[PDB]
Enzyme design. Sequence first.
Site, short mmCIF file in Angstrom:
data_model
loop_
_atom_site.label_atom_id
_atom_site.label_comp_id
_atom_site.label_asym_id
_atom_site.label_seq_id
_atom_site.Cartn_x
_atom_site.Cartn_y
_atom_site.Cartn_z
N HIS A 26 -3.01 -15.57 20.18
CA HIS A 26 -1.56 -15.90 20.16
C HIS A 26 -0.85 -14.95 19.21
O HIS A 26 -1.32 -14.77 18.09
CB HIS A 26 -1.39 -17.37 19.75
CG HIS A 26 -0.11 -17.98 20.21
ND1 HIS A 26 0.34 -17.84 21.51
CD2 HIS A 26 0.81 -18.73 19.57
CE1 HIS A 26 1.47 -18.50 21.65
NE2 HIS A 26 1.80 -19.03 20.47
C1 LIG Z 1 3.39 -16.85 9.14
C2 LIG Z 1 2.27 -17.36 10.02
C3 LIG Z 1 1.83 -16.61 11.07
C4 LIG Z 1 0.80 -17.05 11.92
N1 LIG Z 1 0.43 -16.24 12.96
C5 LIG Z 1 -0.51 -16.68 13.76
C6 LIG Z 1 -0.88 -15.88 14.87
O1 LIG Z 1 -0.36 -14.80 15.11
N2 LIG Z 1 -1.84 -16.37 15.72
C7 LIG Z 1 -2.44 -17.56 15.50
O2 LIG Z 1 -3.30 -17.91 16.31
N3 LIG Z 1 -2.14 -18.34 14.44
C8 LIG Z 1 -1.20 -17.93 13.61
N4 LIG Z 1 -0.84 -18.72 12.53
C9 LIG Z 1 -1.53 -20.00 12.31
C10 LIG Z 1 -0.93 -21.13 13.10
O3 LIG Z 1 0.46 -21.11 12.90
C11 LIG Z 1 -1.46 -22.50 12.68
O4 LIG Z 1 -2.87 -22.45 12.56
C12 LIG Z 1 -1.08 -23.62 13.66
O5 LIG Z 1 0.34 -23.66 13.84
C13 LIG Z 1 -1.54 -24.97 13.17
O6 LIG Z 1 -1.18 -25.99 14.11
P1 LIG Z 1 -1.42 -27.49 13.65
O7 LIG Z 1 -1.59 -28.36 14.85
O8 LIG Z 1 -2.52 -27.42 12.64
O9 LIG Z 1 -0.06 -27.87 12.90
P2 LIG Z 1 1.17 -27.01 12.37
O10 LIG Z 1 1.39 -25.89 13.33
O11 LIG Z 1 1.01 -26.63 10.93
O12 LIG Z 1 2.32 -28.13 12.49
C14 LIG Z 1 2.57 -29.13 11.43
C15 LIG Z 1 3.92 -29.76 11.68
O13 LIG Z 1 3.74 -31.19 11.71
C16 LIG Z 1 4.73 -31.82 10.94
N5 LIG Z 1 4.13 -32.33 9.74
C17 LIG Z 1 3.46 -31.60 8.82
N6 LIG Z 1 3.07 -32.34 7.80
C18 LIG Z 1 3.50 -33.63 8.10
C19 LIG Z 1 3.38 -34.87 7.43
N7 LIG Z 1 2.76 -35.02 6.26
N8 LIG Z 1 3.92 -35.96 8.02
C20 LIG Z 1 4.54 -35.80 9.20
N9 LIG Z 1 4.72 -34.69 9.91
C21 LIG Z 1 4.17 -33.63 9.30
C22 LIG Z 1 5.81 -30.79 10.62
O14 LIG Z 1 6.83 -30.78 11.58
C23 LIG Z 1 5.02 -29.48 10.65
O15 LIG Z 1 5.82 -28.40 11.13
C24 LIG Z 1 0.18 -18.30 11.67
C25 LIG Z 1 0.62 -19.05 10.57
C26 LIG Z 1 1.65 -18.62 9.76
C27 LIG Z 1 2.09 -19.48 8.60
#
Ligand SMILES: Cc1cc2nc3c(=O)[nH]c(=O)nc-3n(C[C@H](O)[C@H](O)[C@H](O)COP(=O)(O)OP(=O)(O)OC[C@H]3O[C@@H](n4cnc5c(N)ncnc54)[C@H](O)[C@@H]3O)c2cc1C
EC number: 1.8.1.12
Lengths: 488, 490
Positions: B462
């Site tokens: 991604h």
């Molecule tokens: C700058 C940056 C660039 C990246 N680039 C890439 C890339 O190019 N390719 C790739 O594969 N990965 C990339 N990543 C990693 C990727 O973004 C994450 O691994 C992924 O988004 C994680 O998804 P998730 O389901 O863990 O939750 P997240 O994507 O972290 O979503 C969490 C969300 O849930 C909600 N939430 C959070 N905490 C709470 C709480 N305590 N209570 C209620 N709601 C809450 C909020 O709305 C928050 O936005 C990047 C990350 C960053 C920071």
Amino acid sequence: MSRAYDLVVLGAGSGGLEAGWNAAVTHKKKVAVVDVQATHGPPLFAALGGTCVNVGCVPKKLMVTGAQYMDLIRESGGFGWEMDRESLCPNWKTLIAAKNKVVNSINESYKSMFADTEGLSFHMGFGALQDAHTVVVRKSEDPHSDVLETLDTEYILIATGSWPTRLGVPGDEFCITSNEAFYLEDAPKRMLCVGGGYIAVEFAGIFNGYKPCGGYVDLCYRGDLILRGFDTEVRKSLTKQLGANGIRVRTNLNPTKITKNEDGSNHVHFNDGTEEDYDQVMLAIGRVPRSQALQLDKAGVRTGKNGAVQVDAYSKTSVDNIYAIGDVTNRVMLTPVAINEGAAFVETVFGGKPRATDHTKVACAVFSIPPIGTCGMTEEEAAKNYETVAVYASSFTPLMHNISGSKHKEFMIRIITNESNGEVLGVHMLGDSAPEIIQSVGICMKMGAKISDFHSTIGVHPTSAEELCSMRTPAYFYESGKRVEKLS
Amino acid sequence: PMSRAYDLVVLGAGSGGLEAGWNAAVTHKKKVAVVDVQATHGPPLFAALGGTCVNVGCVPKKLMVTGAQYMDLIRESGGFGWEMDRESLCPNWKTLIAAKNKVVNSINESYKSMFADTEGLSFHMGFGALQDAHTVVVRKSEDPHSDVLETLDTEYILIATGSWPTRLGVPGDEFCITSNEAFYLEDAPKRMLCVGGGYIAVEFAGIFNGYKPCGGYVDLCYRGDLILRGFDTEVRKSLTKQLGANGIRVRTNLNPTKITKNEDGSNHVHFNDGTEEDYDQVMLAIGRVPRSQALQLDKAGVRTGKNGAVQVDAYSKTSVDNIYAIGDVTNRVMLTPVAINEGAAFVETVFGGKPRATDHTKVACAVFSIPPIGTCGMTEEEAAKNYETVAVYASSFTPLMHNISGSKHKEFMIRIITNESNGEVLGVHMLGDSAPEIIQSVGICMKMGAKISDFHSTIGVHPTSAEELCSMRTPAYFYESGKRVEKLSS
Ligand SMILES: Cc1cc2nc3c(=O)[nH]c(=O)nc-3n(C[C@H](O)[C@H](O)[C@H](O)COP(=O)(O)OP(=O)(O)OC[C@H]3O[C@@H](n4cnc5c(N)ncnc54)[C@H](O)[C@@H]3O)c2cc1C
Ligand SMILES: Cc1cc2nc3c(=O)[nH]c(=O)nc-3n(C[C@H](O)[C@H](O)[C@H](O)COP(=O)(O)OP(=O)(O)OC[C@H]3O[C@@H](n4cnc5c(N)ncnc54)[C@H](O)[C@@H]3O)c2cc1C
Ligand SMILES: CN(C)c1nc(NCCc2ccc3ccccc3c2)nc2c1cc(C(=O)N(CCCCN)CC(N)=O)n2CCC(N)=O
């Protein structure tokens, strides 16, 4: 008497908006999805969509693609594209706006999703457990703060992702993280990216792109070489081609203090002893599990390594009916994995056939300029495990970069085999159009692919990719995990 | 047997002819002679040391096409904040042509250098033609009555003279041009008819398009309804769309009939539909005859026919037992990584003594139009008439970069053709940016017998245009017994 919700997902992320949408549509179970915010923006940053759509890779790559233009406008001259090129600097204003339009395009597209799907519920605020079956939603991460909603559920999924990690030092307040950087008003003239992660390196390349005429980007890693854990040979080839862009990398160098200034600048003490005034100080120093203010203690689900939620093969936490995925599990800080883990969760529980996500041979990318594709293991790690490691490599300067004047730019390919049977262990690529190639490579590797498979394949000429199938001779080997030049 | 001057002669420093010549001269140490018609690239012979693929082929083409793409990636910059004087953006053709004449004339020098640095691999500059099964005479001109410079005496012979742009076969062909003359035009053409629907007219239509002098246009032109005969239907349609966008008039079901010079110098073109329009240039990219018509293969009992295609078996061995042929003059597959692979297999055959036959199937092609295309394996149409139950997976979208660019019409099309029986990928077809790069690694998966169940159980990258290959789980339609359906009659 059963129960009210079948599931409640904490976090509308890459990982949560798979798990929900799959349980609601493909198994018609009632779902609540708790997320702090409507759409992108400070001060909550993370929104509907997750931390890779709002303050993630979606906005990252857009700004990176804009930052790629500096090069492609410089290079153009050689092909007879006669231009002003005497004061051509860009406009950070029009990029962040066009970037917001698109993140905001996605923010409102996912809302349509909730309103138009039965059994899939949005609940705005911070998620928190009270007991195994009860998820209280509040205005704040504070627990004395106000109950907006009280969800009654059989299952709880946790998908709250990462939150970028802080230096804990004098003047740490004046520095900024990834989040803050997507919503700056001007383009930092004097810029400092601290750290050596993909987090930083990418953001260096971004800030490097949008310089007001005269001004710079310093990097800063507390170790010897940038990008820990990547292919060492590739990591070097990068640091040079970064240098050729204008980016001044510095190594075995850590800040000790920051302080604010006359004109709102940031004075920076270093570990080496030098002091400079940058306009902005980015901490791209990794990120960590956001599991602190969910009160997992309260419901009694184990945490640990930086608060990472402890989970079995199948994403099941220490309470049978609680599960966890994405970045809070801490398994791979990626978008495509958090998804897979969440789709595997639904197939397991509501799905029927137990499944747990395959975390290895994951093809990856870093959108540096120029960018990297890597899948599988480094010669360094290969040497440790497998009996006999063979190491192919090749490097070359693409045709355009003779005419383009960018004589320094070069494509580099490093394949790593198990010599015990001649099977592929890793593939590491630097150069432009890399991460596009690593994907379709990443498939062959998943099947299981020998170097004989690669060199037995007719070329697509003329392309960077075809030197995948033009690598017959190894450059050196490893025995007992110790470098050599032939098999003894 | 009898003791000869050379062990191996080769007619043509081709992609094939130079691969054969080198492998014999170092890894089997034979005294090789390689014949070609000139020092370096350029008129009037064009094709030179390095083959019809380094001088007037692939290499210099794909430089000029990289050079065209910078038209799009300039008015596209505007949305990312790159405010620049686009007022009267007239590009200089001469500086691009200059730039590439320097680049080609360095691969030419770098070939001279290997020859004079290599044990008994000799270069012989002329028109090499056969005298008997063990003799090759080299004349100063292609005419038999032309002066003789050498008479090579050899055990084996190899034919690697490749292909040659085919004439239109209509009055006023003397006024037209081909691939060859285009690379060495003085100025960029204002009004340009690119005649033919081959991958060569298509790629070249961008060159005149990108480098069109202000106030100028380019028309493509072709025989049939859908350009690029034999590529995927849905690709060939979706391409023509974006050629329109790019600013190309693709006029199908059209074929010029007569050409006649004008007063200024432009070309007055009578069409087949009784139409009349004027063009400053008319480049024919209609086909490639195998180039055997002055080698006297008749005279050495080598069998020709089928356009001039030298008749050869599963191991490249011609009608004569000591004479062999490879590349484009064989006329099997006319790509360069085939001519080379046909070469080094031929050395393992003869001089290696462990024979190997080149495989012409599941070979990834690619076309460098704007945008490019990457294709490996068979089209839905062909496959449905070889298989009980074919299944057409399909997907297409606009990227992230065009979301903000403006050219929001741009698309990246991915169609996977499977055998429903066992879900095995019979063919992949792709349009859009970075395609030829992605297909190369795909052609490896298919050669290992790739199944669809492998694609959609491999985690994606991604965010990438490519990642949609692993996202496809649901088939668009099916082909139950050569006839398209909407679900399997289960
Ligand atoms: C700058 C940056 C660039 C990246 N680039 C890439 C890339 O190019 N390719 C790739 O594969 N990965 C990339 N990543 C990693 C990727 O973004 C994450 O691994 C992924 O988004 C994680 O998804 P998730 O389901 O863990 O939750 P997240 O994507 O972290 O979503 C969490 C969300 O849930 C909600 N939430 C959070 N905490 C709470 C709480 N305590 N209570 C209620 N709601 C809450 C909020 O709305 C928050 O936005 C990047 C990350 C960053 C920071
Ligand atoms: C415009 C264009 C674009 C192309 N693009 C691609 C592409 O993108 N990808 C791809 O794979 N292929 C491409 N090709 C085809 C490829 O470049 C080569 O034509 C072919 O694949 C290699 O054939 P060969 O080995 O016979 O080489 P050739 O170069 O055809 O070998 C013949 C050479 O030998 C010499 N010769 C010819 N006749 C005689 C004679 N009678 N006596 C002595 N010497 C002689 C000449 O120097 C001549 O060039 C392209 C071709 C063209 C024209
Ligand atoms: C099949 N699939 C995985 C999804 N489909 C849809 N809508 C219908 C898509 C579709 C396309 C072609 C089909 C062909 C045959 C049959 C059905 C088809 C359905 N919305 C989907 C979706 C996944 C999702 C979804 O949850 N995501 C879609 C991410 C796509 C980003 N480009 C984020 C996620 N959970 O991973 N959404 C949300 C609607 C949207 N586009 O915002």
